[PDB]
Design an enzyme around this catalytic site. Structure first.
Site, PDB file in Angstrom:
ATOM      1  CB  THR G   9      -0.948   0.010   1.350  1.00 17.74           C
ATOM      2  OG1 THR G   9      -1.950  -1.162   0.917  1.00 17.74           O
ATOM      3  CG2 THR G   9      -1.679   1.143   1.289  1.00 17.74           C
ATOM      4  CB  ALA G  57      -0.288  -6.953   4.770  1.00 15.51           C
TER       5      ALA G  57
END
Ligand SMILES: *[C@@](C)(CO)[C@](*)(O)[C@H](CC(C)C)NC(=O)[C@H](Cc1ccccc1)NC(=O)[C@H](CC(C)C)NC(=O)[C@H](CCc1ccccc1)NC(=O)CN1CCOCC1
Ligand SMILES: *[C@@](C)(CO)[C@](*)(O)[C@H](CC(C)C)NC(=O)[C@H](Cc1ccccc1)NC(=O)[C@H](CC(C)C)NC(=O)[C@H](CCc1ccccc1)NC(=O)CN1CCOCC1
Ligand SMILES: *[C@@](C)(CO)[C@](*)(O)[C@H](CC(C)C)NC(=O)[C@H](Cc1ccccc1)NC(=O)[C@H](CC(C)C)NC(=O)[C@H](CCc1ccccc1)NC(=O)CN1CCOCC1
Ligand SMILES: [Cl-]
Ligand SMILES: [Cl-]
Ligand SMILES: [Mg+2]
Ligand SMILES: [Mg+2]
Ligand SMILES: [Mg+2]
Lengths: 204, 196, 222, 222, 233, 195, 220, 195, 196
Positions: G9, G57
């Site tokens: 991300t 993550a």
């Protein structure tokens, strides 16, 4: 430092009823960095189409090399080279560099002008021929393409239907690969007409 | 491999097992490791199957060409050709070869050629992975000027023990007898030699 | 790959599966591993797919020129010798593992060649990832004085063992029978015991499903 | 040096409907090029209408499922037989996985069931505990083959309405249990064709408000 | 972190209509040296289970001691130790499976592959595998090492799936096992001719056969094989 | 050697190239021109391994100048770029490859169009509206994606270029001592002295 | 050899006249494999606190939900909402204990309190903790910086700021291969955070291309 | 973290510390204060491994502030420096050492003298008229050898410091985004806002 | 090292060479590798001199403590204590030990303990680097229920061959006889055994 996955890209080819289709994405990158979104990977010499994935410098070099060889072929033979014959030429040329190979995954597609038979073929980097009735896949999303083609494909598809199948196979495979996508091109090839369509796909 | 060659009264006898391995898999259980480089000059092959074959093929070629020009070569000459190949290509070869031949003048002769490519003329010679287990046995039991039947028993008992202890050796026991009479092939199966 | 060779009464039979892998992925579900060196000398190939094809074609080419030069039908030992010396020269780097078989004026023959150039002689042989599965069958069912029909059955059963039990092998069974005095019969897809079942659903898309940006007619003519 | 991990292959697949959810997985277990078992289930009913699978290294997969099953048991003891909701199970599993952050369970975990509104739910985990609810998820060896097909057929990705100039997308809708099983069966037959570690058999566990049903289908054994 | 020293090769096994068969040769290899020839690698637990072990022999002897101690421990304060509360194959396996995985998790494994064969109290056949990694699986036929590559193909021709088990007699099943042991002797370089075989039947119980030999071998064709290609003599 | 940029606009190609030459912990020079004129309407900037860069650039320059004399004609930017690519494509499989990345900005007099080619040391050629080599691209590409238009003037292109340099000066770790900017158009090659 | 775990991300958050904008993409990758396009990289710690996720993550998801528990315990014990400084320092002190162990985290603790006002803290896995007005973190951070910095002013409107954050992620989503999926927008004010929707890049790219006239490199 | 300088003059100690914080190919911040006030008349600048620097500085700050409260007394710069050195001297043989280099500038109120201590991550303490850590020293030391005098004023020291920063900005490869300068004297610690 | 223990009619005999090496240098040519862990339980030591000594010292201690509480230990018990040390410390030990003892009930017993720490009860056992060369010889020449003089000759001839071929073995041949009669030490010098 893995030559086959620096630039990224994919090619797929399919057969249909009296037709063939070959398609490729447009991305050229340097690992994570996307550099070009106009880098086509499908070329043609007469009526024979060649798609090439892998290291981009070799993709370019081989296109230039096969243009070179098919031009001399035509001058001496006084006819266009056929897909079956061209497939052998690609294999010969790649295996000539057995211990210093071009880092590529080429794919031949075309219709034999004499018999009218649809023809596709794939190769590994050292020239091993992979012939197929149904479909050939190549590139950084080969796994994805194999899964899409194996489920979506059916035999004897009409040119219009075949277009939808191959396009959906490429698009959804590309969307699951980071190094593939950024646009796509599809060639529909009939006996004496060839349609080229640019697909709308997500640009990430 | 387990291989050996033994000189005796009437000439020389070559002996070998028949096992070829890839790791622990036996790629061939009926291999013929005793090979002809000339009518009455043979060799036992140990080490790399590819290397020993390539070498034996070249030696056969050299001795065939020697025979066309200068007549029958000596066993020493054959060993020298083997040496020349093994020594000069020592960096790229894994070949432990025993050369054995029968002249009429020199009778039975045995030359052994280890990894380095050195030549050693001996009364009898043993080689291969399984030979390690029979140095003690062979040294105690070897005698010069044995008979044919005694030498066959000596080789059979020796290779039986080599096979028994070495996992890299097994199958049948092939033998080749080299005398003035000619060339005789012998084979011995597990059911016989195992229970010796 | 799984490949085998089995000698019988009046000749020799070789067989092979038809799976081609690329890592864990099946690249070709029906590739041809049986190669014609000469009309009555055939070759089953395992290992590096390009190498087995290239080395078989090169020796096959030189065998043809040799046959024309000598005005004689080619011999299996010639193909054997030419293959092993070529492979040995490349110190195993040409990853071709071959079962060479055929009939010639000398008789019927069966050999195997490994990448490093070592050759072996036998009545029954198996090479490739599924050679252990195949060799298990051969060791259990092989006998001396096999007929033509018995050797084909044994060979195909040895390939099937590889197909089912070895993940490296699969799909179909190719066979080539080389009998003395007769033409060699190449039985492509002799068995096809791995037919794909009917799919539950057709994935034929409605026409217009795919979004298009541009169309253009491509010029293939001069 | 001793390597504590191994790859047992196989592949798993979870799809969620409106009032149901399926968790499928092939029954093949492998190491290297050998088949260990043609029927070794790796999709388990864990109670409280939660089905679970942890594909990859089977020893780690079994250990994890075993620990979660035990976590469900103690949840009942410590909280007056309260039903463990799918969202609560997911969070609990994250802590199981992350607990071994520095010596991970080499598995891709998927759980399925119904959420607290009675709607179908699928959760997927990476090896170290990062998790996310989704309508659709494939995991394991052939995940890369199956997943894009699911994007296309379950979530109607890259599909537009015919004649709308690629402007109107194909509308999202829930699939029937019949239509989902069709996609599962086709996904696995396709994966079996092209992936060597996938085959033998397919076991589907369907989860509705009524309970946990099972369905089994043969797959190609090559 | 270990390296195995004295090792045992293939253990093979299969199910049949009324029970299970398991077999393993009597060899303790020391690398290429076939050092020990009187090694029993099938260890019975009670009158209803046989544990077949391959890999490191020192670790095998440790596992023997654990199983021996397990029988002792089960008998403690247990009036039904030779009846309802006797050790089941499933109990013995799960215990070993627990140990194997715990040891691999501590990076100090028991360097073995184990097959627990037996018959449960309700008559059901039990056959399950576990190894140094703690990996477990079950199948109508199970085999370790080279057995996995060569025996399983042969045994799966007899029992290819579950439905073939009732159709397979003890005569047919034992014949396949003995055949598989011969093939392993032909082709496994770290195998011996001498082996042990065990049958656990739901009716006739535990039959343990010692000092078996591979026989009816084909070696005669070897005499016809000359050279490695061209050589005629 | 580090920063080389390129922007093709309506009627010209603009190349910007950093001035710093650094070896170890010392900036040896802050006024280095990382470009060579291949022909009157073709300019090549370069960056990469020390020594290789200049050696390669001058070698190409000599060859193109040789061609110009022989034929009394100027090669098209497309032709020059293809020649350069082939030289790098040869190089990459040599005993010691040229580790040089180049941008070729040229004005085609026959087509009356500006052209910008980006070629890496592998021989990977692409025609682009804007290009960059090295870490520069990780900032400038996204910036140009937003601000670039195809019908821009040379003056608009220079402002667009100033926006890139400012961003690089803000977020790049190394001091590259500003840039030398050069413009290629129908009237040839000229240098912007005040940037 | 080693297992591939979800990473990613691209996140940004900048301070301005009207509070704080926070924008992130939704893509997770395992090497070149696109694992997910629907990842929530923003954690809603409380009505006034946000946490962005980049890098591992699991590491981010696990420790930021843990951070939320520690912030809840603070307001129970102290009868007062935790400061952004204190919240960020709990996380930075935590990862510092794991320094060298191999945690991979690039986070940004964004929020508003009375004493601090709008505040952004960059916190990463090697222990760095920085207060600042603008930060871009992730594999596509440089691409986001390029657009953000060149268009950033303190006097941006709420509407223009929301768009610039969205546009900066889009820029990175386009160029960075490991960024994409969709854009998640947030606006933090004195009254707390406000969610400004999920924006799929599939439609957003073409919508922005047409309306803005940008992305001329792409075949229209 | 990179550039930290220190100059002791007649009546004060002057610390200069770079503002840039760089991670990868991105300058994340250009206004970072790489220092902590240990006590009213003692200031410590720091540079080294990310995270370690601030963690160590604040840990020392907490300890010195604890001492100040306990004794209602300010430790001398010499005493503080010895405490800091011992902490680093412990650290270097720990499982994971603090990879932090510090300068401690202080004004001793009992002696009425400024004092500058340079301590590296190994715990190597030296009192100096001028000091630096990292690659900075390779330029500044020789420069100060030439221009430094012991009887200089604070204003002369700042000009001498400007001369160092200019030289670093000219010859250093990395952009360190200028420096925050702080002065330590009899009246305590204050920051020069315009540098 | 070359070591062996052989059971026979009246009990058991342990045998060993006397060579200790550091690389190719002989650090001790008169080493005593036969060591007492109990009155009539001895062991042959091969592998690391330091490890085998440390182990033998601990075993002697354990058996001395065993004897104080439970009386004379069995040869099996002694072997089990050796095993426990060798197995549990397999990662840090290089010790190939042969345990040999004489009970009145069990007569002569021999247990061999290789590197892994496994236990193997055998009629006779051989170990050490030089044992490889006499597997063939010993297997062919060993018989059960031999006499004392026959067993001494069997050990002498065997270790003579082991010494002859193994560079890591040599010096004198020490032997220890364990019977009901008691404990007898024997020594044999090169001038005797070399020319066998
Ligand atoms: C005994 C067995 C030991 O000395 C005998 O000497 C025989 C001699 C007969 C066969 C001539 N030796 C062998 O059988 C020989 C053993 C050996 C192995 C490796 C190196 C040297 C000697 N076996 C072979 O040569 C086999 C024969 C093939 C299987 C038919 N070949 C291999 O093992 C090849 C050879 C590689 C090689 C290495 C060094 C020099 C030359 C060749 N090895 C492999 O294919 C490796 N294999 C890959 C897959 O994983 C397992 C190992
Ligand atoms: C059984 C099935 C397995 O051994 C058989 O042996 C078959 C033999 C038949 C096909 C003749 N073996 C294979 O199919 C063989 C297995 C293999 C793979 C790799 C190395 C050795 C053996 N498969 C191949 O040779 C495939 C053929 C494909 C399907 C066309 N080739 C590859 O996988 C190539 C290998 C190229 C190679 C280079 C250098 C040395 C040896 C082989 N690999 C790739 O193309 C992978 N990669 C993808 C991106 O582009 C760069 C290369
Ligand atoms: C025969 C010789 C081999 O089987 C016997 O087994 C005897 C056993 C008798 C002595 C009980 N073994 C040895 O003599 C033994 C050989 C050996 C060497 C290393 C590991 C295992 C076995 N020799 C020794 O133990 C000597 C005895 C000293 C000289 C008194 N020790 C060494 O050689 C030491 C051993 C260090 C060691 C290594 C691994 C595990 C345990 C201990 N090595 C050195 O001193 C190294 N040396 C330094 C000078 O340069 C040459 C190497
Ligand atoms: Cl051979
Ligand atoms: Cl000693
Ligand atoms: Mg199979
Ligand atoms: Mg992208
Ligand atoms: Mg000696």
């Amino acid at each position: 430092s893995d030559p086959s996955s620096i630039n990224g890209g994919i090619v797929v080819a399919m057969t249909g009823k009296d037709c063939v289709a070959i398609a490729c994405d447009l991305r050229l990158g340097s690992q994570s960095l996307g550099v070009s979104n106009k880098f086509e990977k499908i070329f043609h010499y007469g009526h024979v189409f060649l798609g090439i994935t892998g290291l981009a410098t070799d993709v370019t070099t081989l296109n230039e090399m096969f243009r070179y060889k098919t031009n001399l072929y035509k001058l001496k033979e006084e006819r266009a080279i056929e897909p079956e014959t061209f497939t052998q030429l690609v294999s010969s040329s790649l295996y000539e560099r057995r211990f210093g190979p071009y880092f590529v995954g080429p794919v031949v597609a075309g219709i034999n002008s004499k018999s009218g038979k649809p023809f596709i073929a794939g190769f590994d980097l050292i020239g091993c021929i992979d012939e197929a009735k149904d479909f050939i896949v190549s590139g950084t999303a080969s796994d994805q393409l194999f899964g899409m083609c194996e489920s979506l494909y059916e035999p004897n598809l009409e040119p219009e239907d075949l277009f939808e199948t191959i396009s959906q196979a490429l698009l959804n495979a590309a969307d699951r690969d980071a190094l593939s996508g950024w646009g796509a091109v599809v060639y529909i090839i009939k006996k004496d007409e060839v349609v080229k369509r640019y697909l709308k796909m997500r640009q990430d | 491999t387990s291989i050996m060659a033994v000189t005796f009264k009437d000439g020389v006898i070559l002996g070998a097992d028949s096992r070829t391995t890839t790791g622990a898999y036996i790629a061939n259980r009926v291999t013929d490791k005793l090979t002809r480089v000339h009518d009455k000059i043979w060799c036992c092959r140990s080490g790399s199957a590819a290397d020993t074959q390539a070498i034996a093929d070249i030696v056969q070629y050299h001795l065939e060409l020697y025979t066309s020009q200068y007549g029958t070569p000596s066993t020493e000459t054959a060993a020298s050709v083997f040496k020349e190949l093994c020594y000069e290509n020592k960096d790229n070869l894994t070949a432990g070869i025993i050369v054995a031949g029968y002249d009429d003048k020199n009778k039975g002769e045995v030359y052994t050629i280890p990894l380095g490519g050195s030549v050693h003329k001996l009364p009898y010679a043993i080689a291969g992975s399984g030979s390690t287990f029979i140095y003690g046995y062979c040294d105690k039991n070897f005698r010069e000027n044995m008979s044919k039947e005694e030498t066959v028993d000596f080789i059979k008992h020796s290779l039986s023990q080599a096979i028994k202890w070495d996992g890299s050796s097994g199958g049948v026991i092939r033998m080749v007898v080299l005398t003035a009479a000619g060339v005789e092939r012998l084979i011995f199966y597990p059911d016989e030699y195992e229970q010796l | 790959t799984t490949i085998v060779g089995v000698k019988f009464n009046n000749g020799v039979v070789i067989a092979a599966d038809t799976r081609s892998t690329q890592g864990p992925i099946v690249a070709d579900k029906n590739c041809a591993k049986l190669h014609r060196i000469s009309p009555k000398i055939w070759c089953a190939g395992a290992g590096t797919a390009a190498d087995t094809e290239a080395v078989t074609q090169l020796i096959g080419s030189n065998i043809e020129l040799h046959s024309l030069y000598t005005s004689r039908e080619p011999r299996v030992v010639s193909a054997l010798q030419m293959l092993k010396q070529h492979l040995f020269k490349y110190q195993g780097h040409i990853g071709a593992y071959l079962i060479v078989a055929g009939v010639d004026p000398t008789g019927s023959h069966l050999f195997s060649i490994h990448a490093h150039g070592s050759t072996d002689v036998g009545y029954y042989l198996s090479l490739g990832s599924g050679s252990l599965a195949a060799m298990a069958v051969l060791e259990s069912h092989w006998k001396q004085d096999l007929t033509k029909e018995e050797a084909i059955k044994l060979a195909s059963d040895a390939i099937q063992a590889g197909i089912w039990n070895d993940l490296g092998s699969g799909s179909n069974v190719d066979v080539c029978v080389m009998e003395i005095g007769k033409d060699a019969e190449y039985l492509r897809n002799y068995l096809t015991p791995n037919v794909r079942e009917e799919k539950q659903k057709s994935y034929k898309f409605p026409r217009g499903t795919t979004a298009v940006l541009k169309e253009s007619i491509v010029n293939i003519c001069d | 040096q001793f390597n504590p991990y191994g790859d047992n292959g196989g592949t798993i697949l979870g799809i969620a409907g409106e009032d149901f959810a399926v968790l499928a997985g092939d029954t093949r277990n492998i190491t290297d090029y050998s088949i260990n078992s043609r029927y070794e289930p790796k999709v388990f009913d864990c109670g409280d209408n939660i089905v679970m699978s942890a594909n990859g290294f089977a020893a780690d997969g079994d250990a994890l499922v075993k620990r979660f099953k035990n976590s469900v048991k103690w949840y009942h003891f410590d909280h007056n037989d309260k039903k463990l909701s799918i969202n609560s199970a997911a969070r609990n599993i994250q802590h199981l996985l992350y607990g071994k952050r520095f010596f991970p369970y080499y598995v891709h975990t998927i759980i399925a069931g119904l959420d607290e509104d009675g709607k179908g739910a699928v959760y997927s985990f990476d090896p170290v505990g990062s998790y996310e609810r989704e309508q659709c998820r494939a995991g394991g060896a052939a995940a890369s083959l199956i997943m894009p097909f699911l994007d296309n057929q379950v979530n109607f990705k890259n599909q537009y309405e015919p004649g709308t100039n690629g402007k109107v997308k194909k509308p999202l809708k829930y699939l029937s249990v019949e239509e989902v099983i069709k996609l599962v069966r086709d996904s696995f037959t396709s994966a079996t064709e092209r992936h060597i570690q996938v085959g033998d058999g397919l076991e589907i566990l369907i989860v509705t408000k009524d309970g946990v049903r099972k369905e089994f289908y043969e797959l190609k054994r090559d | 972190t270990q390296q195995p020293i004295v090792t045992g090769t293939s253990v093979i096994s299969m199910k049949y209509d009324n029970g299970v068969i398991i077999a393993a040769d009597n060899l303790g290899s020391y690398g290429s040296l076939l050092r020990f020839n009187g090694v029993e690698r099938l260890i019975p637990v009670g009158d209803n289970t046989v544990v077949g072990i391959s890999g490191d022999i020192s670790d095998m002897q440790h596992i023997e001691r654990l199983l021996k101690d397990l029988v002792t421990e089960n008998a403690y304060d247990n009036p039904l130790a030779d009846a309802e509360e006797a050790l089941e194959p499933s109990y013995i396996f799960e215990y070993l499976a627990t140990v194997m995985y715990q040891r691999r998790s501590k990076m100090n494994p028991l360097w073995n592959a184990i097959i627990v064969a037996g018959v449960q109290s309700n008559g059901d056949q039990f056959l399950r595998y576990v190894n140094l990694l703690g990996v477990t699986y079950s199948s109508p036929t199970l085999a370790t090492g080279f057995g996995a590559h060569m025996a399983n193909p042969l045994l799966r021709k007899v029992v290819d799936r579950e439905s073939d088990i009732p159709k397979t007699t003890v005569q047919v099943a034992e014949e396949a096992i003995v055949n598989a042991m011969r093939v392993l002797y032909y082709r496994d370089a770290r195998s011996s001719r001498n082996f042990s075989l065990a049958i656990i039947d739901k009716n006739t119980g535990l039959t343990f056969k010692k000092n078996l030999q591979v026989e009816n071998m084909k070696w005669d064709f070897a005499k016809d094989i000359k050279g490695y290609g061209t050589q005629k003599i | 050697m580090d920063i080389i940029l390129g922007i093709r606009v309506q009627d010209s190609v603009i190349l910007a190239s950093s001035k710093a030459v650094t070896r170890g912990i010392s900036v040896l020079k802050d006024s280095d021109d990382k470009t060579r004129q291949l022909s009157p309407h073709t300019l090549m900037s370069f960056a990469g391994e020390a020594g290789d860069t200049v050696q390669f650039a001058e070698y190409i320059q000599a060859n193109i100048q040789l061609y110009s004399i022989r034929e009394d004609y100027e090669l098209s930017p497309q032709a020059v770029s293809s020649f350069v690519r082939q030289e790098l494509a040869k190089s990459i499989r040599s005993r010691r490859p040229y580790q040089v990345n180049v941008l070729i900005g040229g004005y085609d007099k026959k087509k009356n169009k500006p052209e910008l080619y980006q070629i890496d040391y592998l021989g990977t050629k692409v025609e682009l509206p804007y290009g960059a080599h090295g870490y520069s691209g990780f900032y400038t590409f996204s910036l140009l994606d937003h601000h670039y238009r195809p019908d821009m003037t040379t003056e608009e292109g220079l402002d667009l270029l100033k926006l890139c340099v400012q961003e690089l000066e803000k977020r790049m770790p190394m001091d590259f001592k500003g840039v030398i900017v050069k413009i290629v158009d129908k009237d040839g090659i000229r240098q912007v002295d005040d940037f | 050899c080693k297992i591939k775990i979800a990473h990613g991300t691209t996140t940004l958050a900048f301070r301005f006249q009207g509070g704080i904008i926070v924008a992130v993409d939704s893509r997770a990758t395992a090497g070149n494999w696109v694992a997910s396009q629907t990842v929530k990289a923003v954690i809603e710690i409380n009505p006034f606190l946000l946490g962005t996720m980049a890098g591992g993550a699991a590491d981010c998801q696990f420790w930021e939900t843990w951070l939320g528990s520690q912030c809840r315990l603070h307001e129970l014990r102290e009868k007062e909402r935790i400061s952004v400084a204190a919240a960020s320092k709990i996380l930075s002190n935590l990862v510092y204990q794991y320094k060298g162990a191999g945690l991979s985290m690039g986070t940004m603790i964004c929020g508003y309190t009375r004493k601090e006002g709008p505040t952004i803290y960059y916190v990463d896995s090697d222990g760095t903790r920085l207060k600042g007005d603008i930060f871009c973190v992730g594999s596509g951070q440089t691409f986001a910086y390029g657009v953000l910095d060149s268009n950033y002013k303190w006097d941006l409107s709420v509407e223009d700021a929301l768009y610039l954050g969205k546009r900066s992620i889009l820029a990175a989503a386009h160029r960075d291969a490991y960024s994409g999926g969709s854009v998640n927008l947030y606006h933090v004010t004195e009254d707390g955070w406000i969610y400004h929707g999920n924006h799929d890049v599939g439609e957003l790219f073409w919508k922005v291309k047409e309306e803005e006239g940008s992305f001329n490199n792409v075949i229209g």
